[PDB]
Write a protein that binds this ligand. Structure first.
Ligand SMILES: *[C@@H]1O[C@H](CO)[C@@H](O[C@@H]2O[C@H](CO)[C@@H](O[C@@H]3O[C@H](CO[C@H]4O[C@H](CO)[C@@H](O[C@H]5O[C@H](CO)[C@@H](O)[C@H](O)[C@@H]5O)[C@H](O)[C@@H]4O)[C@@H](O)[C@H](O[C@H]4O[C@H](CO)[C@@H](O)[C@H](O)[C@@H]4O)[C@@H]3O)[C@H](O)[C@H]2NC(C)=O)[C@H](O)[C@H]1NC(C)=O
Ligand SMILES: *[C@@H]1O[C@H](CO)[C@@H](O[C@@H]2O[C@H](CO)[C@@H](O[C@@H]3O[C@H](CO[C@H]4O[C@H](CO)[C@@H](O)[C@H](O)[C@@H]4O)[C@@H](O)[C@H](O[C@H]4O[C@H](CO)[C@@H](O)[C@H](O)[C@@H]4O)[C@@H]3O)[C@H](O)[C@H]2NC(C)=O)[C@H](O)[C@H]1NC(C)=O
Ligand SMILES: *[C@@H]1O[C@H](CO)[C@@H](O[C@@H]2O[C@H](CO)[C@@H](O[C@@H]3O[C@H](CO)[C@@H](O)[C@H](O)[C@@H]3O)[C@H](O)[C@H]2NC(C)=O)[C@H](O)[C@H]1NC(C)=O
Ligand SMILES: *[C@@H]1O[C@H](CO)[C@@H](O[C@@H]2O[C@H](CO)[C@@H](O[C@@H]3O[C@H](CO)[C@@H](O)[C@H](O)[C@@H]3O)[C@H](O)[C@H]2NC(C)=O)[C@H](O)[C@H]1NC(C)=O
Ligand SMILES: *[C@@H]1O[C@H](CO)[C@@H](O[C@@H]2O[C@H](CO)[C@@H](O)[C@H](O)[C@H]2NC(C)=O)[C@H](O)[C@H]1NC(C)=O
Ligand SMILES: *[C@@H]1O[C@H](CO)[C@@H](O[C@@H]2O[C@H](CO)[C@@H](O)[C@H](O)[C@H]2NC(C)=O)[C@H](O)[C@H]1NC(C)=O
Ligand SMILES: *[C@@H]1O[C@H](CO)[C@@H](O[C@@H]2O[C@H](CO)[C@@H](O)[C@H](O)[C@H]2NC(C)=O)[C@H](O)[C@H]1NC(C)=O
Ligand SMILES: *[C@@H]1O[C@H](CO)[C@@H](O[C@@H]2O[C@H](CO)[C@@H](O)[C@H](O)[C@H]2NC(C)=O)[C@H](O)[C@H]1NC(C)=O
Ligand SMILES: *[C@@H]1O[C@H](CO)[C@@H](O[C@@H]2O[C@H](CO)[C@@H](O)[C@H](O)[C@H]2NC(C)=O)[C@H](O)[C@H]1NC(C)=O
Ligand SMILES: *[C@@H]1O[C@H](CO)[C@@H](O)[C@H](O)[C@H]1NC(C)=O
Ligand SMILES: *[C@@H]1O[C@H](CO)[C@@H](O)[C@H](O)[C@H]1NC(C)=O
Ligand SMILES: *[C@@H]1O[C@H](CO)[C@@H](O)[C@H](O)[C@H]1NC(C)=O
Ligand SMILES: *[C@@H]1O[C@H](CO)[C@@H](O)[C@H](O)[C@H]1NC(C)=O
Ligand SMILES: [Ca+2]
Ligand SMILES: [Ca+2]
Ligand SMILES: [Ca+2]
Ligand SMILES: [Ca+2]
Ligand SMILES: [Ca+2]
Ligand SMILES: [Ca+2]
Lengths: 695, 938
């Protein structure tokens, strides 16, 4: 019987396809002006119309390339692979979807580039001194986490121009520091010193050649340096298959975009590279500082991990900036850079603990949905990101690509990849919403019966003011007949009121501030649900009173966002790991918790109860976390094992519990150990005492 | 929306001069003519030995787009001594900033450098020059004996400037006092008056200036941007200034008093690095005589649809209120990296609607990043956030971006017509463009068909060609047009009429005009002035019954109209515009006479009725409410019948229900044609006799406030019949209810204490927490989840203080969070134990000595809570039972509450009561193994 395809998609082949993925068409008058067009597929097939005629195109997602994921990183010969399918061909029909997956891996022994970009303001002279030892010292540590490593060097001290630099009050001051019994080199801006070599020894050599300059103004021009170190990838020499660390070390405030106007530098940062043969940033004195947005898109495009190695006095500052430049890390630097080694090492593990996908060149009318599988086989939906990982781990993501209608006659390609990774899934999209017989269709007057109309795919539409199964009655004065199976049941309604039943069909006379389609004047283009003012909350198109939502919108009203960042907290975890994200808002779970991200829970049990099951987990091989096999992931606090606790006058928290052996375990907890948390356990739990009188 | 973009006036300076970097109008009182002033800060001049001193150009509008430099200073550098310049003019960016008021014009070189008179320096103090006819004075406030970065050495005075009503200059010096920045203001009379060329550091008498501050405030750049306007009630223009690096690059906007340099208000940005303060503007956007503040933060990153940061720029819009509290809203750019908040230029009343307007520039936007200017119209509400026009940059880059919109000036009707015009500067291509506003006109179109219902039998008038008669009717259109400003009196309109609009689409043409015998007809009409509603009539006939078959559909008469463009313009081709919110067509409709009884007049009988699906609407949040409506016609056919459910616009309309075949799915739309508040649903054009309809209309009512006891909907059916054309009006109450799911819950942070208590021993008279026992926290939380709020409540804690005469849990201190006071019936911490640095089994207040804490809770709203943090120490002495060893004790406190008051004092309420108990179990764990008859020892 008449179902969806029948009521809507009986106007033509494209209309039939455009209705739904369920629909199919006939060819070459298989049932000559019989009755049923489109309907479904089995039904149409059941009505003889069968052979080279079905016209039922299925959607597809053929994998074109899927090399296996690698085991080693430095082990090449075979090109290193961290994303399991690399290219995948998608064919979608109109208003249709197909799903697929992508396995991302944090590969063991992956090579690493480390470019050291340092402030050389006078304050950094004692820093520079202790850095000479670095390099070979850094090489021996990285030896552990990686095999094939290479490092480089660059330095910055703001634009050499008339506000920041010592203009030239005397000429002698062009070589500054005359003011205070000493000597320092002139202001330079950005100076690339060492291209990324694997000859670690020469790092120590070049750093010893360096010397500091001086700046009148407190803030400095690091962002020129960060930008140029990022985009002059030929000069700096970043490899393709390797992790990129841009260690940015400063002890000062920083100039930002639009500051340059004071200097009379009114030209915006172009994003291009401008470090020539002299290895100096030649745009320095003519181009303005880059904006955070521009810094973000170039760091992302060249897969560079900006590490903020800043001093305590100015750490809050760069933490806030870091937070506006997602993916960036920040650590506390010493007054003399003693602790750089560990900051770099700590930063590396930071940025290889996480894996978030990216999407580039996504066709406008296409929309994607992500589920994340990152712990065991637990699938957390609406998530494209995963954290808490460690080198060797492989996560997985499930993707659903859905098209809305029938886009341009052109095969479009786009890319899904992890942030900072070389590897990527490339998705070739072809929109399959035209029938094979479309082109083989000549209307030109005749051929569609003894008249003048238009012809194609086993049926014909007659020209302006005619229609009819074959070709009859131009404009009423003839209508008086037919009647038509017009309204289902034939209870008298003509064509949903707004329309007149002619020639075995309807003439929807209305054109009421919009479109009006459907063979019984079924569908309104406008009469749709309202959230407040606009149609689909102003986030969707409408057809037969049904909202088709824009990308990143869901629900019947198209008012439910698919964003998760609003559910995120500075914690890192989603909804404070205490709730689920629904339309970019956390619905809090049973702990009696509240707040925008479920961060508040004054009536929650104390940390002790959550740490013990991880002590029992880690140190006793038992508990809930052990049974779910979530020990190794859900807690990377350093559990040490003391023989005694201490009234140390520090952040101590004595937790005691009776274990299943019936012994009283006691452990103190210690956070803010430089932004990280360790956990001490008394190695001698208190137990019952059986007869021990020398026996 | 009325800026002529076809033929704007185009001006250009020499290449590389940054011609257009600063723009303004020159409106001298000595002349009937007006000019425009373009700053060209990199322009070379004839000044001896000075490269790129920059200049300012006076440009003729009176045809001839040629520009002439204003000769401010034709001299090169002065000399401290021989072969030892006192100053450096080359590269001074003179013309980087340009403002004029009447005959006076101020221009500044914010990169002008100055050797000190103490040491050999090169300090960018900045200078300005004030001209008036031939008289020219130099105004260089920052060039004083305060001579380094700690002083005004790097001041760059003239970076931004402004004249006040009255006559007084505001000047921005963003480098003063270690780049804290500075505002300085001076009387124009004073500058000219006290000018002395033999003195480089002139001291003006009534100078107002911001002073140096603490070093945290360094590198803030006060005076980066500047604007003037009255904010401290009445009197004089006060000083507004952007401070872009303020508050850790959050940026700020300071406002100082005009009378003295006293602080009035500050604004602060939400996002660091976004340059909140780059640009500022003051102008009364809502026509209430109160200046309103606009703040550009052009590098702002809003959040995309994906959730990702994206640099689009943002403009803040703060509406001033007679109170003092500004009423602020935000306005985001439309393209990534097109710097939306770069320039905010008040236009005055661009369209003369009665409210001021404003132009906001995204100077690196548009396809081929040529630059865009968005223009936004003001309204009583505030600024209309949907821009009414987009001025597109025209010139492509030579190298540097053209930066069209980087500077702008409006508010000056440079030609005759009573509409302000606009200068846009494009310095990257050394151009400036004047856009001039077009005249706006309001038309009032009339349409009527005198015989509304057409009787096919009534064939009065005869058809011209033939010798027979037809059932004809009269159609009459009419136009009244008028508009403010200079515009012609003779207005030409091309009117077009169409019979049976919703039918010509493929189907038969049921009505035609008498003389043409066509459904379409044109008419070159020529109305004038304003008021004279000029008319023109036409008689249209109806076809013979003998076969247009449709007799139920209405015959919609459609009228549209268009202005003629060039026959309307002035001498230099300034064509007038129609009012953007005025439709250029109107619809009326006739219905063929069908049924209506022997008397030929259709008399309907319309009835409407509803019922309460859900009887309650709980106060304090949004609430879903659907009401079923029964509209029936028991009389004759009602033409254009439609239900008018007037809803209390504390409620919104979602839609008709399509979740039930028992209800009809009507065609509905919400509207408010001044004061009205209604959804209008179609009940059929001819709603035939006896046609009863059933429909569901779902809503959501927000009503959070304590207004009326109920909420009222009025509904009635209405039609276009001459008689009995409406139903009676029918009200429908809905009862507002109170509901406040209030809950109490508690916890004991150490829920247990194992009694092998480490490093403990008895102290005769103890001090410290260590000497008494471990800390036991008991947090108690009362939270109102429920939609409705409560205004008062009582909280009662019962605390197990002592068992027998032994002190169990000893309370050191309790804390409170939220609207709540508390009182303990016993002195807490009697023993003065201070340190902080932050029935055998169950022992409750039944069997134990009770310490009570009463608390008086204030108003808790939906999703809010009061919290009692009770910090106590366990009195170990006791549990070392000197009676004999031990036993497991469960120390239980309990807290109950009672809600006593609600803010909805005129509505059914009810006291809410509940309680919780939190427990701290003290046990040993480590306890004796088997042994027969011995005893214990200490
Ligand atoms: C809009 O926002 C802006 C800024 O965001 C606000 O502007 C600030 O307002 C503050 C409060 O009025 C101002 O601070 C005051 O400064 C004066 C004068 O400072 C001078 O003298 C100081 C010594 O007296 C000297 O600094 C020394 O002392 C400092 C102590 O703060 C030390 O930190 C420093 O190392 C120095 O040794 C300065 O250099 C100046 O020469 C002070 O008198 C004020 O003190 C007040 O408060 C203290 C509290 O401890 C009290 O004892 C005093 O009796 C006195 O009442 C205060 O510090 C600040 O200067 C100002 N900044 C700018 C740039 O304008 C603005 O108020 C705000 N307005 C609105 C509408 O919101
Ligand atoms: C106002 O009027 C002044 C004239 O006094 C103009 O100033 C000079 O303009 C020129 C051109 O813009 C400046 O440029 C000079 O070009 C040299 C490099 O270009 C050559 O090499 C490139 C290859 O890279 C070729 O493509 C090209 O054909 C050239 O052959 C520089 O090496 C020159 O350096 C000299 O100037 C600097 C300025 O700081 C000084 O250190 C020395 O004098 C040095 O010899 C030079 O830069 C030239 O600098 C300008 N002179 C100055 C600074 O006064 C302005 O352009 C003009 N502006 C306007 C708005 O009209
Ligand atoms: C998109 O819009 C729809 C409606 O236009 C929103 O759904 C509405 O949500 C309200 C408020 O929760 C629902 O009312 C009631 O909520 C209480 C919660 O205390 C619940 O217990 C009741 O059962 C009832 O649902 C209401 O049902 C619903 N409106 C209707 C009639 O559909 C939706 O929230 C919007 N999406 C978002 C989150 O933006
Ligand atoms: C701290 O000690 C107290 C005191 O014993 C514990 O309270 C007891 O909690 C248990 C488990 O929650 C309750 O058991 C239940 O008892 C009811 C009888 O009303 C029975 O129907 C259930 O099947 C169940 O056995 C018990 O009510 C309660 N004590 C009594 C006798 O009232 C508390 O749980 C302890 N907390 C810790 C740290 O475990
Ligand atoms: C992620 O998980 C959900 C499973 O809930 C997948 O699809 C949803 O499944 C059920 C019904 O089939 C409902 O919860 C939703 O209506 C479904 N979502 C839709 C409309 O697709 C979802 O597709 C999974 N994501 C991927 C890409 O695998
Ligand atoms: C500068 O002028 C303003 C008003 O124009 C003064 O503000 C008032 O000052 C008096 C005297 O201290 C106070 O009683 C008022 O309460 C102030 N008005 C306000 C802020 O409400 C200000 O004191 C003057 N300051 C200087 C530097 O003279
Ligand atoms: C019969 O129809 C004619 C039109 O064909 C009607 O005559 C017009 O009536 C309107 C008012 O209803 C007048 O304004 C027109 O001027 C009339 N036209 C003329 C002069 O013919 C008429 O009303 C109908 N029958 C009667 C007698 O009322
Ligand atoms: C007659 O004017 C109407 C408006 O009264 C026009 O219809 C649409 O109106 C919407 C706003 O309600 C505009 O956004 C559209 O531009 C209009 N659509 C069309 C078809 O242009 C309409 O322009 C006029 N009708 C015709 C076709 O002459
Ligand atoms: C007080 O709050 C309690 C919540 O503990 C409510 O009781 C709940 O509902 C039933 C019936 O009262 C109880 O049997 C359950 O134990 C409660 N559910 C739980 C455990 O969450 C009760 O409605 C309230 N009583 C008063 C006095 O208002
Ligand atoms: C899509 O859903 C899941 C992906 O997680 C997969 O199991 C299933 O095979 C896919 N189904 C289709 C439509 O092929
Ligand atoms: C930076 O640190 C965090 C992140 O935004 C927050 O506490 C605060 O906004 C910032 N602190 C400063 C520098 O004010
Ligand atoms: C259409 O067909 C008719 C036959 O009745 C013929 O007269 C006419 O010329 C044809 N029109 C075209 C397509 O040229
Ligand atoms: C309409 O008027 C114009 C004169 O402005 C004329 O050129 C044109 O011929 C007229 N059109 C008609 C309806 O004849
Ligand atoms: Ca140092
Ligand atoms: Ca004032
Ligand atoms: Ca106002
Ligand atoms: Ca206006
Ligand atoms: Ca004008
Ligand atoms: Ca009648």
């Amino acid at each position: 019987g008449p179902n969806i395809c029948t009521t809507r998609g009986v106007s033509s082949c494209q209309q039939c396809l455009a209705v739904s993925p369920m629909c199919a068409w006939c060819s070459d008058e298989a049932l000559p002006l019989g009755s049923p067009r489109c309907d479904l597929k089995e039904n149409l097939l059941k009505d003889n119309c069968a052979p080279e005629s079905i016209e039922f195109p299925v959607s597809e997602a053929r994998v074109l390339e899927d090399r296996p994921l690698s085991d080693k990183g430095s082990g090449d010969s075979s090109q290193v692979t961290q994303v399991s399918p690399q290219r995948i061909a998608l064919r979608l029909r109109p208003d249709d979807s197909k799903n697929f997956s992508i396995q991302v891996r944090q590969v063991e022994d992956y090579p690493v580039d480390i470019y050291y970009l340092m402030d050389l303001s006078y304050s950094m002279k004692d820093d520079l001194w202790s850095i000479q030892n670095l390099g070979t010292k850094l090489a021996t540590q990285m030896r552990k986490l990686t095999s094939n490593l290479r490092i480089g060097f660059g330095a910055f001290v703001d634009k050499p121009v008339s506000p920041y630099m010592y203009i030239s009050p005397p000429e002698a001051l062009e070589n500054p520091c005359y003011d205070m019994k000493t000597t320092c080199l002139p202001m330079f801006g950005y100076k690339h010193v060492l291209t990324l070599t694997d000859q670690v020894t020469r790092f120590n050599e070049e750093v010893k050649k360096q010397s500091v300059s001086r700046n009148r103004d407190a803030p400095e021009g690091g962002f020129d340096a960060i930008m140029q170190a990022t985009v002059c990838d030929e000069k700096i020499g970043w490899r393709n298959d390797a992790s990129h660390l841009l260690v940015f070390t400063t002890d000062a405030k920083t100039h930002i975009a639009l500051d340059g106007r004071l200097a009379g530098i009114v030209q915006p940062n172009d994003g291009q590279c401008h470090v020539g043969s002299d290895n100096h940033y030649s745009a320095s004195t003519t181009m303005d500082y880059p904006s955070l947005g521009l810094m973000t898109e170039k760091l992302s495009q060249k897969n560079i991990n900006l590490i903020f190695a800043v001093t305590e006095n100015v750490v809050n500052l760069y933490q806030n900036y870091s937070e506006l430049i997602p993916g960036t890390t920040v650590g506390v630097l010493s007054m003399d850079s003693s602790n750089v080694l560990q900051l770099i090492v700590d930063a590396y593990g930071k940025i290889r603990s996480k894996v978030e996908l990216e999407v580039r060149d996504l066709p406008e009318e296409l929309s994607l949905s992500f589920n994340a599988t990152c712990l065991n086989n637990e699938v957390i939906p609406g998530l494209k990101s995963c954290m808490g990982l460690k080198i060797g781990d492989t996560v997985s993501f499930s993707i659903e690509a859905k098209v809305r209608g029938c886009p341009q006659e052109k095969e479009k390609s786009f890319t899904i990849k992890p942030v900072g990774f070389k590897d990527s899934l490339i998705v070739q999209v072809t929109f399959d919403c035209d029938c094979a017989c479309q082109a083989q269709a000549e209307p030109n007057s005749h051929r569609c019966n003894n008249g003048n109309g238009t012809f194609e795919c086993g049926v014909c539409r007659c020209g302006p003011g005619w229609l009819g199964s074959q070709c009859e009655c131009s404009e009423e004065d003839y209508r008086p007949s037919q009647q038509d199976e017009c309204s289902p049941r034939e209870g008298q309604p003509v064509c949903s009121q707004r329309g007149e039943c002619l020639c075995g069909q309807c003439v929807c006379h209305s054109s009421d501030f919009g479109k009006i389609t459907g063979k019984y004047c079924e569908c309104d283009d406008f009469s749709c649900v309202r959230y407040k003012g606009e149609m689909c909350s102003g986030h969707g198109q409408c057809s037969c009173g049904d909202c088709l939502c824009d990308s990143d919108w869901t629900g019947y009203y198209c008012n439910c966002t698919t964003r998760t960042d609003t559910c995120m907290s500075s914690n890192g975890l989603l909804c404070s790991g205490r709730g689920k994200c629904e339309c970019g808002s956390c619905v809090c779970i049973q702990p009696g918790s509240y707040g925008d991200t479920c961060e508040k829970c004054p009536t929650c049990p104390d940390a002790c109860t959550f740490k013990k099951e991880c002590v029992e987990c880690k140190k006793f091989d038992r508990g809930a976390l052990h049974d779910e096999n979530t020990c190794n992931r859900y807690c990377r606090d350093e559990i040490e094992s003391v023989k005694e606790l201490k009234d140390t006058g520090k952040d101590a928290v004595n937790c005691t519990y009776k274990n299943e052996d019936d012994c009283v375990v006691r452990f103190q907890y210690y956070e803010d150990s430089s932004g990280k948390s360790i956990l001490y356990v008394v190695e001698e739990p208190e137990c019952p005492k059986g007869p021990d009188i020398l026996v | 929306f009325n800026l002529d973009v076809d033929s704007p006036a185009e001006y250009s300076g020499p290449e590389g001069s940054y011609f257009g970097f600063a723009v303004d109008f020159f409106v001298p009182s000595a002349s009937s003519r007006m000019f425009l002033l373009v700053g060209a800060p990199k322009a070379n001049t004839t000044q001896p030995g000075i490269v790129e001193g920059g200049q300012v150009l006076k440009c003729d509008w009176s045809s001839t787009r040629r520009c002439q430099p204003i000769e401010f200073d034709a001299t090169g550098n002065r000399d401290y001594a021989k072969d030892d310049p006192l100053e450096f003019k080359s590269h001074q960016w003179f013309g980087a900033s340009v403002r004029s008021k009447q005959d006076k014009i101020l221009a500044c070189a914010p990169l002008y450098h100055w050797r000190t008179e103490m040491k050999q320096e090169r300090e960018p103090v900045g200078t300005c020059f004030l001209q008036d006819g031939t008289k020219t004075v130099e105004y260089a406030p920052c060039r004083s004996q305060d001579i380094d970065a700690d002083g005004q050495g790097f001041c760059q005075g003239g970076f931004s400037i402004d004249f006040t009503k009255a006559d007084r200059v505001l000047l921005g010096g963003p480098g003063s006092f270690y780049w804290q920045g500075q505002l300085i203001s001076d009387q124009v009379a004073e500058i000219v008056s006290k000018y002395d060329p033999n003195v480089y550091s002139i001291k003006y008498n009534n100078q107002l200036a911001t002073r140096t501050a603490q070093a945290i405030f360094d590198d803030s750049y006060l005076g980066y941007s500047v604007a003037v306007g009255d904010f401290n009630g009445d009197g004089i223009d006060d000083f507004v200034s952007g401070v872009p690096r303020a508050a850790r690059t959050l940026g700020m906007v300071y406002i100082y008093d005009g009378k003295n340099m006293s602080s009035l208000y500050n604004f602060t940005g939400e996002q660091m690095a976004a340059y909140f303060g780059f640009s500022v503007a003051a102008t009364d956007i809502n026509g209430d005589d109160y200046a309103d503040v606009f703040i550009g933060a052009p590098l702002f990153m809003d959040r995309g649809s994906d959730g990702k940061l994206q640099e689009v720029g943002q403009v803040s819009v703060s509406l001033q209120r007679a109170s003092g509290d500004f009423q602020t809203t935000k306005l985001n750019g439309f393209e990534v990296f097109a710097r939306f908040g770069s320039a905010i230029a008040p236009l005055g009343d661009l369209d003369q609607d009665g409210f001021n307007d404003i132009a906001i520039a995204a100077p690196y936007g548009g396809e081929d990043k040529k630059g865009i200017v968005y223009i936004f119209n003001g309204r009583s509400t505030g600024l209309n956030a949907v821009p009414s026009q987009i001025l597109e940059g025209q010139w492509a880059a030579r190298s540097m971006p053209p930066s069209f919109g980087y500077s702008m000036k409006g508010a000056t009707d440079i030609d005759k017509n009573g509409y302000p015009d606009l200068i846009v500067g494009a310095f990257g291509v050394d151009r400036a463009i004047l856009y001039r506003a077009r005249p706006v006109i309001t038309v009032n179109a009339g349409l009527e068909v005198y015989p509304s219902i057409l009787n096919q039998d009534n064939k009065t008038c005869s058809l011209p060609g033939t010798a027979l008669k037809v059932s004809c009717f009269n159609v009459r259109f009419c136009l009244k047009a008028d508009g403010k400003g200079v515009l012609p009196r003779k207005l030409n309109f091309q009117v077009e009429l169409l019979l049976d609009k919703l039918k010509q689409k493929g189907a038969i043409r049921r009505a035609l005009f008498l003389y043409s015998r066509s459904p379409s007809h044109s008419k070159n009409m020529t109305i004038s002035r304003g008021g004279l509603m000029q008319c023109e009539e036409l008689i249209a006939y109806l076809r013979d019954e003998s076969e247009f078959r449709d007799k139920l559909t209405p015959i919609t008469i459609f009228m549209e109209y268009r202005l003629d463009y060039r026959t309307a313009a002035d001498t230099t081709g300034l064509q007038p515009i129609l009012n953007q919110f005025t439709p250029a067509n109107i619809s009326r409709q006739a219905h063929i006479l069908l049924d209506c009884g022997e008397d030929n007049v259709c008399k309907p009988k319309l009835e409407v009725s509803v019922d309460s699906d859900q009887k309650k609407i709980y106060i304090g949040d949004d609430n879903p409410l659907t009401l079923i409506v029964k509209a029936q016609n028991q009389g004759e056919g009602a033409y254009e019948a439609e239900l008018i459910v007037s809803i209390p616009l504390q409620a919104d309309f979602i839609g008709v229900v399509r979740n039930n075949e028992a209800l009809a799915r009507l065609s509905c739309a919400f509207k408010t044609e001044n004061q009205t508040r209604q959804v209008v649903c179609d009940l059929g054009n001819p709603m035939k006799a006896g046609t009863q309809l059933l429909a569901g209309l779902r809503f959501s009512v927000h009503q959070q406030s304590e207004m009326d006891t109920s909420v009222k909907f009025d509904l009635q059916i209405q039609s276009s019949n001459l008689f009995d054309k409406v139903s009676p009006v029918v009200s429908h109450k809905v009862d507002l209810a109170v509901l406040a799911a209030v809950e109490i819950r508690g916890v004991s942070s150490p829920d247990h204490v194992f009694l092998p208590i480490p490093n403990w021993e008895h102290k005769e008279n103890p001090e410290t927490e260590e000497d008494v026992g471990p800390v036991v926290q008991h947090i108690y939380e009362l939270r109102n989840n429920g939609p409705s709020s409560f205004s008062k409540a009582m909280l009662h804690l019962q605390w197990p203080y002592k068992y027998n005469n032994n002190t169990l849990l000893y309370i050191l201190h309790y804390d409170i969070d939220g609207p709540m006071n508390c009182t303990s019936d016993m002195e807490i911490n009697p023993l003065r134990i201070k340190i902080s640095s932050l029935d055998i089994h169950t022992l409750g207040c039944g069997v134990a000595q009770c310490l009570k804490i009463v608390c008086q809770v204030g108003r808790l709203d939906r999703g809010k809570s009061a919290i009692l943090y009770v910090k106590s120490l366990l009195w170990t002495e006791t549990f070392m039972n000197k009676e004999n060893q031990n036993h497991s004790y469960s120390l239980k406190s309990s807290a109950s509450f009672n809600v006593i008051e609600f803010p909805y004092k005129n509505l059914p309420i009810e006291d809410i009561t509940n309680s919780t108990l939190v427990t701290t179990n003290v046990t040993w764990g480590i306890q004796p193994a088997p042994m027969p008859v011995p005893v214990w020892v200490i």
